[PDB]
Amino acid sequence: LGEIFKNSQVPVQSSMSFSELTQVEESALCLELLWTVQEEGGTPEQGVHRALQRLAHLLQADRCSMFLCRSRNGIPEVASRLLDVTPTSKFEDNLVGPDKEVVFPLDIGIVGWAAHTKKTHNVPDVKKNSHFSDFMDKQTGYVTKNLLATPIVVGKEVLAVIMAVNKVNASEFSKQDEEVFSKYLNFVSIILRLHHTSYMYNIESRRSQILMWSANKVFEELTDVERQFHKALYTVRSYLNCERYSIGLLDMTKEKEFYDEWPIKLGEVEPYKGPKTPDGREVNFYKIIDYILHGKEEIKVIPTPPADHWTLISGLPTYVAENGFICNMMNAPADEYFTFQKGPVDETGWVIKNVLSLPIVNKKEDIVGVATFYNRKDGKPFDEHDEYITETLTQFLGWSLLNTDTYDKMNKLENRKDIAQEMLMNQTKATPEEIKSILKFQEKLNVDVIDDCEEKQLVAILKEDLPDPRSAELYEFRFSDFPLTEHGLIKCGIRLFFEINVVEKFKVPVEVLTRWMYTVRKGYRAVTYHNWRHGFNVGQTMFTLLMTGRLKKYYTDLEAFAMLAAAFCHDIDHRGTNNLYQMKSTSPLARLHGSSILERHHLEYSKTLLQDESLNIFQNLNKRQFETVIHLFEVAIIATDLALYFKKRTMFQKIVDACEQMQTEEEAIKYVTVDPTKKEIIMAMMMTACDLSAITKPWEVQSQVALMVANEFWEQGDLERTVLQQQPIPMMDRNKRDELPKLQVGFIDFVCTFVYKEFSRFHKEITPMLSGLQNNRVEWKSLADEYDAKM
Amino acid sequence: QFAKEYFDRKLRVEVLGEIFKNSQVPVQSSMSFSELTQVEESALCLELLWTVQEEGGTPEQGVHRALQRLAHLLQADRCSMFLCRSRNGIPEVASRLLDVTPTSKFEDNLVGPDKEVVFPLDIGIVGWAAHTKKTHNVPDVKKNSHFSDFMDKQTGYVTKNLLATPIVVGKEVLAVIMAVNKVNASEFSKQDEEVFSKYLNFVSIILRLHHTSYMYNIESRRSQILMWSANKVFEELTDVERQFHKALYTVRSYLNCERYSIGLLDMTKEKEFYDEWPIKLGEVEPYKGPKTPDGREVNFYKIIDYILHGKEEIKVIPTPPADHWTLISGLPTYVAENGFICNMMNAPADEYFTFQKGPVDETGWVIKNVLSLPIVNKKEDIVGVATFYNRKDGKPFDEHDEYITETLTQFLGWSLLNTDTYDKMNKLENRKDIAQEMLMNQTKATPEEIKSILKFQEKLNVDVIDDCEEKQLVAILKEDLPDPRSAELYEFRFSDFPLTEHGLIKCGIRLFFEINVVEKFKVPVEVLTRWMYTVRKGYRAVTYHNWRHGFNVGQTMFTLLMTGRLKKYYTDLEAFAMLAAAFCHDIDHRGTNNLYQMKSTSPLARLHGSSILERHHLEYSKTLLQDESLNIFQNLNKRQFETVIHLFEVAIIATDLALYFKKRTMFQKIVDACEQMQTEEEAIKYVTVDPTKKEIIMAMMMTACDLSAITKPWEVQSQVALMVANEFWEQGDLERTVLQQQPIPMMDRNKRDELPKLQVGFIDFVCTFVYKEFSRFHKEITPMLSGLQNNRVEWKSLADEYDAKMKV
Amino acid sequence: GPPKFKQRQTRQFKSGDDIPGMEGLGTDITAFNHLELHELAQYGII
Amino acid sequence: KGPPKFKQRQTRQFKSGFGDDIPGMEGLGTDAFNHLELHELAQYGII
């Protein structure tokens, strides 16, 4: 006993010294314990088991144990992982499966107090501590009279609590035992830190993959809530890692129709009583999407599910819809409140073990759906990490609800635009009475309202009811529309279309042509100057240029057809305000079209008119010819913008100079025709000349037209002053009315003179136009100088 | 004796504590690993065990401690550590610890990023060791085929023997450990390799801990970048610039870069014809220069800079010059041209790219590392180039940072759906507004049409402006309008056949004047006339649902309110709104039933789920009322206007027959309750107390007015039934030709002779209930029902003739 | 010459016939007396 | 019995909303003739 004093005896055999051998064997065993973690394919539980066996051997204790720490619903708890670990014990028998664990909340149990305090706790007598619990002792029939537990804390977080119980050869765990425990559990802490870091990396990788795939599927196509949610969930199937999960979508109709409210207010039907979302809507799951992953990988959709549906049999989805909480539940059927299915859920042997239900939340914090995730692939209950992943997924879906709403708004806007355009086309299109007012088939052919007459007969009868082209000076630059009514202008326009020999050549219908002419007239508004009279004047000027000006030799019949049509439709639906007011007033036209707002609007409207089969004047020509006509139409209408003409003046001048040096007309025709760009430039200049042709009219017509233009510009300036609070330019200012002559002189010297000078140089037959302009300028000078005399 | 180690086993706890405490702190020095007793070897193992337990710090300290331990265990010198990296999918090895010697301080051994030496895996035996992931032990390295002498030339130190073992975790190599120039001997030793491996086990443990922590950190950064980008993208719809700026600025804390910028390319693919003219004519030479794979010119139209190294500023340069510090080097243009992910370390050292070799903003910031990535469409078309400059840590960009930024740019490229959708939304909204404005201009009555009715110019001699008081206009209009007694507007037997449509407009304005609402609510006369003419023009030219049907329905309601004495339950404002809704209950009727709208999938059917045409009429009436010129409800309070709008909705929606069929029973109950009241005033109070009762009665009045043609005399009824039959036959023809479906017997022309019988089946099924209940409610509506019965008899007679015609 | 650079990675996330159950997801569809059920359809009321 | 306690939604993490608080957004939403024409052209309102 105590007779011989303590000494570090040298064994000579099998050992140099007791302490030296102890240190050597301890170092070797610790090295092997560290190498355990490097053995890929194993688990940290095996290393912890080896460490606990060594600790039990060294401390002369019994039944070493480990309790892992979880966090559910925001509260921590512990669960036994390794129990009754003793020296020379099998790992498989010692490990506790997820279905046999005992869960302790932090507030009960010595394990709970150790985890909460994050410090070593050594209790010599369990009966003297209020934190001791008898749950495990009564469950397993084991008596404990000594405890020593230190938590495994890394990163200010507890992973496990490891204890030793009932020292066999003593009644107390001394301080040295506590120190040895602390160091060995530091090594176990290294192992558990490695494991926890790997688990964190896997969790974050799963979360990032979920976000990638949800973003890829959401931005793939703009669809509704159901299809988008189905795509996202079906894609992130693998990364959820759940045996089975579902999503239920609630109805979003926050208000009832007035005819469904009468029985409620009259008392015929009792008021609704039952679950309600925080917004106040009745909890009505209108669709359930079930994803089956345990076997056969089934996916099913239940529209208007019954209350007998296995997802809704328990009250958890309805509870989530009512409250909006995140519900984490372990051993759900054992719970009394929610009444889960204790037995098999369906015909196959599947039972509900753990449930995780989260709500999908709109921008307005409304509840759009409830996503319920059932038992995990492994037997372990849902941790805080699974809650993190599923919460991120549900937040992403609630955000993509914006894309769903935008798709719905897209559909509504498209439908409203289609309805408005159709109604506008119905209003604008010429009525059959208006067509009959021109194509008098009833009073001349003796036929019923229904048209079954031959096209040639229609051409022949219409050609006898149109104004004579030689009379009314339709071929002359002096043509004045003042003595003609608008119906006469329509008739003259149809006659102009007939005179170039394109109705018979391209087999355009007579009724279609008349309807198109009348619709084009009705498209022009009732503004002072940019009305149907201006459109017909431009069309007649283009016809004069093509026929009298001998420019038709540069263009084919189809091209001339396009020129006449675009000249007639060059100013369609003009509101009376130029591009500057469109930009300054932030009109929808300016927001839709960037450059040449009015020209692009006219082109779009005229192409819309040509799209309809009842107005398509180019109905019977080839596809390539139609594409050519559309391109010609675009060029002609866009060229009417005077900025483009100002930019291309020099190009046209170069073309004219090149053509002037040739002594043979055939050579000039060959030079122009072979290059489509030259034809397009000449066409743009022709359109500009047609638009400005009002200047070249005789003096009375020019004076009246200039007065009309001035009256339109003054109205625009007054409206700009009223609604834009800006001072108009002197040209558009009404108070500068007496300044009208001088300005016009400038307009002749700045814009119009170049076009007609270059056209007179290019073609001598267009000489009168320029001449007329000069005469008009002289007259305006006589009005400007008088103003200087009036001053 | 007789007690062998038992007492020692009892006291072993104190010994373990003592040895742990007294061997944790002190550091032991020993040589050659073979002149060492097991005790000090165990103590060394405990030292390195403690060193593994970092408890905070950096892995390089523990690696260096282990390296010097190995240096004085192997009798070698100048041990080294090479960290393996990956750039552009190419693995490389850099030097992290150089010339590790026993009793050598750690600071001198560490190699900063500035002075690191990088070897490709095809250069040096370190490269082969990292490639094969196997232990290599080479003497006489000058005779080896893999040895590279570049480091020896750089440092002036000769090597003769070496033993390099790569550190590999998870099939990935992290570092290569070298021991060189064994002293007093050559060839190393097999036991030297064994101890090398058994301590590189400690080194691998440390490296595995550090690598797992780093991988977790980068994955967390990627996940948070994804979260923040998704949160900012889904906030609202916006164009490319603002969306990209929000997404890139919100994640500035997770991108460990001192500076980074984004440059956006011009998206215009084709040019206008007038811009193409100079090129085609040859006056301007064709553009030669950088071009994206899609063929567009490489033009950066806007650049956003994010400066984070000093004072945080976000410079936005619209149309940046080529002098901009991002574009002076060719990297952004190279990325725009090719679309490769470019990782550049030591950027100024490169020759192809003219990166600035000094400070760029006069703030002392010098470009060291660059990472440039392209952003693509769904069509694999480049939209922008994102350039991330030198890393915060100073180390060159590796595969992990490339992963993070590549995921960010992939998300940004996917996010362009919300920009294309934004542009489409703007275009669709603008086109809808333009179409509605032009439709309203086409539909609204011209001033000439107003002057036709309101002849102010012929009685006040103004002829120019409506500068007169409202009393003058009222007096002028009252004389012109027809007298209600002369035109039989009050009678139930009124027929619109003699009158013209202009006469119908005049009679409608007269009806509005009769109920005394123009004067009380101060409805402008010109506004009222314009609204009436606009409502007339809104009705299409269909056979039955034309302006005449709307006028007949309005006049029937006027008769019910005045002659039928049903105005007792309704106030003046309710009667006004009710008449206005009656006149517009069938506005803009295409000429088809709701079933045709549903089957044909018309835009109306997709826009409105149920009661399609009725909701369309209500929406169009509200659109008419929105215009100030057409708004007869101008001078009304907000509450009164809300009441009028509610009455409009109820009336126009209840116009349909399915709702009436579903709600017949409540009207029957109301009539039954009112029938038992002993006094008229009690019934009036009972009806007027509950608003729902008034709404039900008004809906039933809508239904009665809508079918009023049945109660007209036989001459009117025959023509009206012929019109309705013609409309239904036209719809049936449309269904047969377009929808390729056989129509119901009513809409089939072949069942034309069956029109009488069906009308009988109509009269006793839909109209008889409502008219009988109204007759029971008010005896003044007794003639209507009476007339209905007479009409039925006539139809019955015709049916009998049919029964004869097919009997023979 | 330019250094060798990494090509763009698109196959991994490149990836509804593929997604089962989408056929019954595009549109969702939800009263009178016994005799009225046929007469209403006869007259086109519904 | 009472329902088990459940965690509340972490709306505080991303509560933030959209606006111009991001620096540099004020200039981010939106982005030819002869000398004599510069004034005469604008005086006629042609441009």
Ligand SMILES: Nc1nc2c(ncn2[C@@H]2O[C@H](COP(=O)(O)O)[C@@H](O)[C@H]2O)c(=O)[nH]1
């Ligand atoms: N001062 C003046 N300007 C005119 C005259 N004729 C046309 N313009 C200008 O030329 C423009 C032609 O545009 P468009 O007719 O294609 O809409 C007009 O809007 C107007 O600004 C005119 O006789 N006098």
Ligand SMILES: Nc1nc2c(ncn2[C@@H]2O[C@H](COP(=O)(O)O)[C@@H](O)[C@H]2O)c(=O)[nH]1
């Ligand atoms: N068989 C038959 N149906 C009618 C008659 N008058 C109206 N209807 C039906 O009742 C509907 C009333 O709704 P509304 O079209 O007037 O808004 C008509 O569309 C039509 O279906 C009729 O005289 N005979």
Ligand SMILES: Nc1nc2c(ncn2[C@@H]2O[C@@H]3COP(=O)(O)O[C@H]3[C@H]2O)c(=O)[nH]1
């Ligand atoms: N059967 C058994 N019970 C244990 C073991 N370790 C702890 N316990 C008991 O489980 C109990 C859990 O709560 P306590 O910490 O209060 O007390 C604990 C011990 O009484 C063990 O290894 N085996």
Ligand SMILES: Nc1nc2c(ncn2[C@@H]2O[C@@H]3COP(=O)(O)O[C@H]3[C@H]2O)c(=O)[nH]1
């Ligand atoms: N001067 C010096 N060279 C070293 C050191 N460690 C390795 N090297 C050498 O750097 C070289 C890099 O390429 P090698 O692998 O072929 O061979 C390596 C060694 O020869 C060291 O600590 N100091």
Ligand SMILES: [Mg+2]
């Ligand atoms: Mg124009």
Ligand SMILES: [Mg+2]
């Ligand atoms: Mg209707």
Ligand SMILES: [Zn+2]
């Ligand atoms: Zn014009």
Ligand SMILES: [Zn+2]
């Ligand atoms: Zn009707």
